[PDB]
Design an enzyme around this catalytic site. Structure first.
Site, PDB file in Angstrom:
ATOM      1  N   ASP A   1       0.914  -1.307  -0.015  1.00  0.00           N
ATOM      2  CA  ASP A   1      -0.138  -0.062   0.016  1.00  0.00           C
ATOM      3  C   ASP A   1       0.894   1.326  -0.210  1.00  0.00           C
ATOM      4  O   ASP A   1       1.830   1.192  -0.335  1.00  0.00           O
ATOM      5  CB  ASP A   1      -0.799  -0.216   1.207  1.00  0.00           C
ATOM      6  CG  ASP A   1      -2.158   0.620   1.422  1.00  0.00           C
ATOM      7  OD1 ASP A   1      -2.184   1.672   0.656  1.00  0.00           O
ATOM      8  OD2 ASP A   1      -2.931   0.209   2.135  1.00  0.00           O
TER       9      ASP A   1
ATOM     10  N   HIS B   1      -3.724   6.381   3.338  1.00  0.00           N
ATOM     11  CA  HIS B   1      -4.422   5.223   2.833  1.00  0.00           C
ATOM     12  C   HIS B   1      -3.983   4.001   3.675  1.00  0.00           C
ATOM     13  O   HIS B   1      -5.006   3.171   4.332  1.00  0.00           O
ATOM     14  CB  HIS B   1      -4.485   5.004   1.344  1.00  0.00           C
ATOM     15  CG  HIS B   1      -5.193   3.890   0.787  1.00  0.00           C
ATOM     16  ND1 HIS B   1      -4.758   2.631   0.326  1.00  0.00           N
ATOM     17  CD2 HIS B   1      -6.390   3.887   0.515  1.00  0.00           C
ATOM     18  CE1 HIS B   1      -5.625   1.968  -0.046  1.00  0.00           C
ATOM     19  NE2 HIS B   1      -6.610   2.535  -0.204  1.00  0.00           N
TER      20      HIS B   1
ATOM     21  N   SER C   1     -11.086  -1.284  -0.530  1.00  0.00           N
ATOM     22  CA  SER C   1      -9.816  -1.453  -0.143  1.00  0.00           C
ATOM     23  C   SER C   1     -10.252  -1.718   1.485  1.00  0.00           C
ATOM     24  O   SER C   1      -9.943  -2.723   2.118  1.00  0.00           O
ATOM     25  CB  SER C   1      -8.901  -0.291   0.040  1.00  0.00           C
ATOM     26  OG  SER C   1      -8.404  -0.111  -1.147  1.00  0.00           O
TER      27      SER C   1
END
Lengths: 288, 10, 92
Positions: A28, A68, A228
């Site tokens: 990620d 994120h 996600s």
């Protein structure tokens, strides 16, 4: 008094150290490894393979770059709001500050995981790929090879309100592909798009307004939405299932995920007509 | 859930 | 028999960098030799190439930065299974 998503994955009729036999690899963005929610639970590997950000005057602020990945690490193993609070995580950076990566960087990252495993084997591995690009023969092949080597892969279905078979790694059959549902158990809308669907999706999981670690401060929390987040719930549930039954093969684990899912709670009218019979009407849940 | 908090909301 | 593939979503393509995937069971020594053979053959035609990475462990092959003009040549190298142009992935 509990985040809606953690209540939703609990059987209708909070495990404090679930998933401790499993190591979850996260490919990620960079992560705020000292955030109280995930400090000591995530080991930041030396791996980094990212493209340059778009725009000559881009400002690399850690709080933004880490957003994120920090939230997803929290969804998997976070102290307060995580699914599998005993799972260890290892992070690889394959997405830049704008959330963009390359297929080649992701391939090199998947290779790094297998090499790391061969050098110092631990328990069962779960690899979370909360990313998507167009259909890629090479990315699907690398995912298939890593799954055949005994590693469990979980990926986001994609946020394009489209058939997941047109994206990768979503389209790799050996990968568990996860769509997103909301608090009303309906497919998530994200602006004019939303969760992907179709025969390449294995199941859905909570993916709207998910409380998780915010990289804005060491104790901050923020809600985020997307496939996600839904994939991170399934990586946490898989870590819990594999920790309770470590001998499970990939096929057996997939059977457990389907068996324990909530069935027929999604209104199929949200999907395009021809996709209704092809899309699994399943929302992930922990076993009792 | 929706929002932002300086500590764990729950 | 080796084939070339590029992303169908044209804005997500990353031309100029290619993943050369070799046949299953190709050894790392063979992958490195094939990468050097590509550089030498490309140089005979006046092209610069850069081998960014040599893969082994899941898929044998290598990542090369080069002109797409060399793709017909590269597909004829020994052990090649297929070549894919690099492309973008995005956080979901």
């Amino acid at each position: 008094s509990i985040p809606w998503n953690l209540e939703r994955i609990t059987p209708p009729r909070q495990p404090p150290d679930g998933g401790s036999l499993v190591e979850v690899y996260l490919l990620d963005t960079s992560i705020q490894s000292d955030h109280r929610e995930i400090e000591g639970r995530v080991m930041v590997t030396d791996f980094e393979n990212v493209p340059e950000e778009d725009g000559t005057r881009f400002h690399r602020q850690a709080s933004k770059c880490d957003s994120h990945g920090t939230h997803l690490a929290g969804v998997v193993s976070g102290r307060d709001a995580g699914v599998a609070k005993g799972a260890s995580m290892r992070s690889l950076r394959v997405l830049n500050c704008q959330g963009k990566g390359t297929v080649s960087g992701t391939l090199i990252g998947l290779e790094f995981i297998r090499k790391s495993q061969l050098v110092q084997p631990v328990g069962p591995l779960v690899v979370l790929l909360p990313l998507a690009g167009g259909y890629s023969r090479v990315l699907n092949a690398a995912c298939q090879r890593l799954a055949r080597a005994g590693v469990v892969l979980v990926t986001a279905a994609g946020n394009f309100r489209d058939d997941a078979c047109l994206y990768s790694p979503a389209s790799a059959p050996e990968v568990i592909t996860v769509g997103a549902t909301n608090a009303q158990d309906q497919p998530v809308t994200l602006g004019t798009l939303g969760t992907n669907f179709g025969r390449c999706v294995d199941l859905f999981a909570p993916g709207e307004d998910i409380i998780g670690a915010s990289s804005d401060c060491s104790t901050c929390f923020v809600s985020q939405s997307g496939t996600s987040q839904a994939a991170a719930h399934v990586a946490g549930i898989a870590a819990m299932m594999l920790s309770a039954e470590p001998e499970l093969t990939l096929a057996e684990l997939r059977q457990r995920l389907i068996h324990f899912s909530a069935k027929d709670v999604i209104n199929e009218a949200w999907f395009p007509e021809d996709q209704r019979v092809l899309t699994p009407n399943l929302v992930a849940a922990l076993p009792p | 859930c929706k929002x932002w908090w300086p500590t764990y909301p729950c | 028999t080796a084939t070339f593939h590029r992303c169908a979503k044209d804005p997500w393509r990353l031309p100029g960098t290619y993943v050369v995937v070799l046949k299953e069971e190709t050894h790392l020594s063979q992958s490195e030799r094939t990468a050097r053979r590509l550089q030498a053959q490309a140089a005979r035609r006046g092209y610069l190439t850069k081998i960014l990475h040599v893969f082994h462990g899941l898929l044998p092959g290598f990542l090369v930065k080069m002109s797409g003009d060399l793709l017909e040549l590269a597909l004829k190298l020994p052990h090649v299974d297929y070549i894919e142009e690099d492309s973008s992935v995005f956080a979901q």
